[PDB]
Design a protein around this ligand. Structure first.
Ligand SMILES: [Cl-]
Ligand SMILES: [Cl-]
Ligand SMILES: [Cl-]
Lengths: 660, 657, 341
């Protein structure tokens, strides 16, 4: 009944700095204008105003309906015009936002949609700093909504208008409360029927409907309640079961409007000594971090790109994700729902880390806008079963303008919006700083063995902190190491992090030792690898090219899994057979005697070097096969590893050459 | 004695796009970071955040005083930090602004000022568009103000704290209402003597004092009424007389704070049919526009630059100047006060003109800020006798977000702030548009004979408008033509304005015809030339080099007066001898036959060509000497002109048929 | 005298030197790296054959100009790497085939021992003692040392100079850092007064050449008051403003146009109350008036320098005027000035 029309095709664009006429060029949404300058490594890429114009014919039959323009993302600040009259402004690059254009168009005519987008710097719109790209543009989809004059309202913070809250969840019973925004845009009072039907496919599981009166040009909220006995729980990747919940408005029979949403029922708690308990059973959060960009296109992502990023994490055995450092797309939360991957999602309250300036500036506009951004985050995505914590900052400092007061304010805003999920944060503060003690959970970013030290520093630090504050729920927000797939060398030696040489073997070593450190500590409720993918950061000058943070387990184009990916796949994915030699891309070696390493989830593998066996071996606790003192021969070599397990015979091999 | 310490020397600077540490460099205020990229013709010059830091030592003997940071101009949005703790933001690149730091520093030790300056694009801080450059930075002076704990307050829209309102002026009597803001920063009540002394050189002209008690931590506004019988009126360039008004705070017989302000007394009115009448006598307003930049340095101007601009204007006989398109430097207002030049100064409410986008966006942060800039402009510069009109917009359009109500709102704000001067605007709308009728006076930007048409079209349009709207007080806000000193040709032909060829002879022809049109029309209360000076406009791609609006009478480096300068000088300056051949820069000619033109304010001159006399000639009504059918030799040629009353002028050129 | 760096210039400018009477050193663009990277000489066949063509072009094109008096062969080459010393000898021989009436010379930055300093008939060195390292007095000792070691060389100073922004001012005379963003004007003034004293006491120098008459373009530079400018001119890059040191030379060198010029007119905000007040004149006397009060008459020293020590300025505004009377001609100069602390 209700209509949702994609508006991405054929816009006109120009930069306000192109001040002459006839300078517009065709673009097609999604779109950023920084996919070339920023990705090329230019730190001063284009940050300012871009102008999108669309011609949209408003049909006559649409008069008497209600028309909305929903934007799923526009970085950073957007001003919307209909036939060149301002209708609204939205400040924030990552929440969806909406405007009703029912009273603003000429029915039966072409009309003009004009979106003036600014991604230039501000001190009053988070994020203010960050180790990533602030791609400017309409980089997510744009939709025309047409509904009945009486509808389930899409206007409240661009939420769906249906909000599904879970309490009393057990293996035996669950209670769901359903908050519905209903809007009467007619001049007449209406007697409507409101109904909720929760379904398993096409089988009704529960159902309640309600008749009530609503005056003209008025909206009110309705909160229905229903129950499910012996509910089918959403249980992570073991069984990511999903009800669909349909809320309908009815009038004289026949549906007049409909909204459907996912319902995944789960209970869980974060235990200071046991970690994360999902539906009564402990669950390691084997996590990675993910940014929303890609090679060549920046953050103008299409559906298939989200799907592919999800598939690669699923393949590696990921069961948790931190979506850094901002609200991300509905269809990615969808995929995490459907795969059973637990989600940490946060507002863009990002501090400087090792860089300059601040993530917090004590401006009324900044503080206020931040609260609206956190309110957008929760109201737009709270229905997703995969979301399990709400994150409030990444790497703020207490020096200069101190955000501790404001963070406490944000924490309270989160609880007003959602009591059912803990808050968390990603800190790089000494443990004594108050801001580590506000959120329900806390976590630190740690690079022991990359930005200085050795991996053993990590377990000591975490052990000490867990001892001094026994009630903290500690996790590793970030840990990782740079790696170019074209940087190879025989020996493990710690590269300079800020230089043009990130040899792949050190990333491998780093994650091996670090996962060992994490896996020995059950008090950590999760760990999150920085990062799943290389991602654009235009100011970086390191690795094999500028403009890239190269700590991904997979390359920026999603083409090449680095060695470390297969290390995590050996450990985390016990379903697909894995047998993978490390260092296949080290193809020109200077030593004759080497240490060979493979990763497997098989019980046993045997190494062969020019057909000459070097023995069977079993992986250690963390899936690592290792043969020291393997003599290669001058010139060409072939290195093959083989494993048999009943009918399952696996093989991996590569070639290489030794010079001197 | 109140202390005023310049803080321009040695600051640390880095762009915020320089994320890495140790990337600061030294700058020395005044400073912009767009003096290289914008003036090189880069359309997307850097519009973003730059961070200035200074270490400043807070002396122990200042504890117990008050301490003010006053910024004369920072484009466009500034946030100021004391020891990295925010103390306020200012939105707007051309008004002065101030923040008190008394309670924000550690006395006796080093402190740090951090000024985070953002010239990035905004849709809520005028100007949004404009044919000029938005040079970012702290491009005007920065002072430390030390005052008594009870002081003449510097905090109200960064005003001087003293307002000199001329409520009645005549050749016999002037009455001046003085408004002084007094601040008590003490925790105890204070009884203080407020005094004002109006001085002529050293002679006290009038004097008024009063005693009151001001309670602790309280601000108050006093209003003393001064009178001057038989006043010495400030009467333009004929006699730019200035009294000095010294307001002082006394306490138990000792002066503790002092503020002096100009007082130039005058009355005037703008007659619909007769033009501008100053102190009872008609003045043609012979005017030019002026921007606050210069080659190589952008808008990071010094005093000598202001002074050289003013002198060049006075040399040409200017007696009115329109300061486009924004509040400019107090120091340049002082100059016009002292020369006697009438000033038109306006808020940066600038529309797109020939270009894209809008001068107005209907959102409340834009409306709010605009009223604040208008209040900033009047409260900060109202004590200059040169400022005679306040302008509200330049080239706004009624399409899209209609700004007409908002301009009515802005008109009422200026009347609230200053009833003694009329409002004006610079329009490019058809006379039908309602926005033309809000301000007391109105004017139009017109380029008949440059952007299409012929100069004769100005008079016809003006005439038609005066007849249709006889109550309008009409002036020409802009008229002008582009020229490069390096584009020369034999004959007069109209260039394509958007092209790379702007021959000088066209600019000279254009101005001589347009002045003729203006000079005939006394109902114009003024005319302003676009522009006195070539200026920066990064998007321009015309003339002899990109990034330059070249409709100036003088070049961007203020080195070379174009031919048109000397036309106006001979018409407007009858005190300095002028005799000047046009076309000396056209040194390679293709025709033997020539029309030789010169400008003069002598009663006659005689032309010589390779020594041969072509005749004594008299100038026309517009100071133009012209000899037709002048016959040049192939090869080298010397053209000379002489007058006696004994002036000479000459240049050499060669002919290649 | 003018040294046209570093390349053949326009005929009309050669003409202008002919007509003023200025002696001209002009040269081929055989320019070395100086303080930068890479080389002026690469031992390619085409490079060498081209260089000869460029020198025959130079001489056959401008030999008629009488102002040209020496022919320059290189600037700041180095012997490290591809040694050009042979190829310098060829060019000098080409010069000799092309023209016998003028000596050849060069502008060196090599230790005096290097052979490439003895090929041409005369030789000069670029010295920056007191700007790039050292004191201005190091220049005298080196020249005399060199003159004593090789009494046959015909030694000139092909380059000496110091950077200055007219917008960099200060109270005291401190050696700035050359590659930094701060070139105060008082230092360039000091540099030239001291270096000219060193030059003018040494008659065995057949000439000296200020680097440079004007600030010139050099995109790579990041010093002084803006990027991309070599700011050692005596006059700005727009030929509009004469820096202090220009007037030190005009007083010294131009004894026909009267000069009376106070130094430091652009330093309009001082921080100290006692000042040394220096002026340059070719008049015989001048009197200094500070806020209308005489600080006495004074005579210029041998190098046209008037100095009044221990000048007391008031806090706030100041007016500094110096005035000369020579029979008919009366000269005055003044500038305003502000003291804060
Ligand atoms: Cl922060
Ligand atoms: Cl507009
Ligand atoms: Cl070399």
């Amino acid at each position: 009944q209700r209509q949702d029309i994609l508006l991405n095709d054929h816009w006109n664009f120009r930069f306000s700095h192109q001040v002459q006429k006839n300078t517009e060029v065709r673009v097609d949404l999604p779109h950023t204008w920084n996919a070339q300058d920023a990705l090329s490594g230019k730190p001063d890429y284009k940050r300012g105003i871009g102008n999108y114009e669309k011609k949209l014919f408003i049909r006559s039959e649409w008069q008497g309906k209600r028309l909305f323009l929903r934007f799923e993302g526009v970085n950073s600040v957007a001003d919307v015009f209909i036939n060149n009259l301002h209708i609204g402004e939205h400040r924030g690059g990552y929440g969806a936002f909406i405007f009703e254009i029912t009273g603003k168009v000429e029915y039966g005519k072409e009309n003009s949609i004009l979106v003036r987008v600014n991604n230039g710097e501000q001190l009053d719109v988070m994020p203010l700093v960050g180790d990533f790209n602030f791609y400017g543009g309409i980089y997510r989809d744009v939709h025309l909504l047409i509904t009945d004059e009486v509808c389930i309202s899409p206007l409240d913070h661009a939420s769906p208008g249906v909000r599904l809250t879970q309490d009393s969840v057990s293996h035996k019973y669950a209670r769901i409360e359903v908050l519905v925004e209903v809007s009467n845009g007619s001049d007449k009072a209406q007697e409507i029927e409101l109904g909720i039907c929760v379904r398993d496919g096409k089988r009704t599981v529960t159902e309640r409907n309600e008749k009530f009166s609503l005056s003209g040009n008025s909206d009110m909220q309705r909160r229905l309640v229903c129950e499910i006995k012996d509910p089918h729980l959403w249980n992570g990747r073991q069984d990511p079961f999903l009800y669909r919940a349909e809320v309908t408005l009815t009038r004289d029979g026949h549906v007049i409007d409909q909204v459907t949403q996912p319902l995944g029922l789960r209970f869980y708690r974060i235990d200071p000594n046991l970690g994360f308990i999902l539906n009564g059973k402990h669950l390691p959060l084997r996590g990675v971090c993910r940014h929303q960009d890609r090679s060549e296109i920046g953050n103008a992502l299409h559906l298939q790109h989200h799907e592919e990023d999800a598939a690669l994490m699923a393949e590696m055995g990921v069961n948790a994700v931190r979506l850094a450092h901002y609200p991300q797309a509905t269809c990615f939360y969808d995929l995490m729902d459907r795969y059973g991957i637990i989600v940490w999602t946060e507002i863009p309250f990002v501090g400087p880390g090792g860089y300059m300036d601040k993530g917090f500036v004590n401006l009324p506009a900044f503080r206020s806008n931040g609260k609206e951004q956190l309110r957008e985050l929760i109201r737009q995505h709270c229905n997703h079963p995969s979301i399990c914590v709400w994150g409030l900052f990444n790497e703020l400092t207490q020096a200069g303008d101190d955000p501790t007061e404001y963070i406490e304010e944000l924490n309270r805003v989160a609880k007003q919006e959602d009591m059912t999920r803990p808050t968390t944060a990603a800190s790089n503060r000494p443990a004594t700083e108050p801001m580590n003690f506000i959120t329900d959970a806390i976590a630190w970013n740690r690079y022991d063995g990359w930005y200085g030290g050795t991996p053993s520093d990590l377990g000591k630090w975490l052990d000490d902190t867990h001892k001094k504050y026994p009630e903290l729920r500690i996790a590793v927000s970030e840990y990782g190491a740079g790696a170019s797939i074209y940087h190879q060398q025989d020996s493990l030696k710690k590269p300079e992090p800020a230089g043009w040489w990130h040899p792949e073997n050190w990333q491998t070593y780093y994650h091996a030792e670090n996962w060992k450190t994490i896996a020995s500590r059950p008090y950590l409720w999760g760990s999150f690898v920085w990062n799943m993918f290389d991602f654009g950061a235009a100011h970086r000058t390191e690795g094999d090219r500028p403009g890239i943070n190269d700590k991904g387990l997979v390359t920026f184009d999603r083409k090449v899994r680095k060695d470390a990916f297969y290390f995590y796949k050996a450990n985390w994915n016990k379903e697909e057979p894995v047998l993978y030699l490390a260092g296949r891309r080290h193809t020109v070696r200077r030593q004759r005697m080497q240490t060979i390493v493979a990763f497997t989830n098989q019980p046993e593998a045997e190494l062969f070097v020019n057909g000459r066996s070097y023995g069977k071996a079993n992986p250690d606790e963390y899936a690592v096969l290792k043969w020291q003192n393997v003599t290669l021969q001058e010139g060409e070599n072939e290195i093959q590893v083989v494993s048999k397990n009943k009918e399952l015979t696996l093989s991996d091999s590569f070639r290489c050459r030794v010079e001197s």
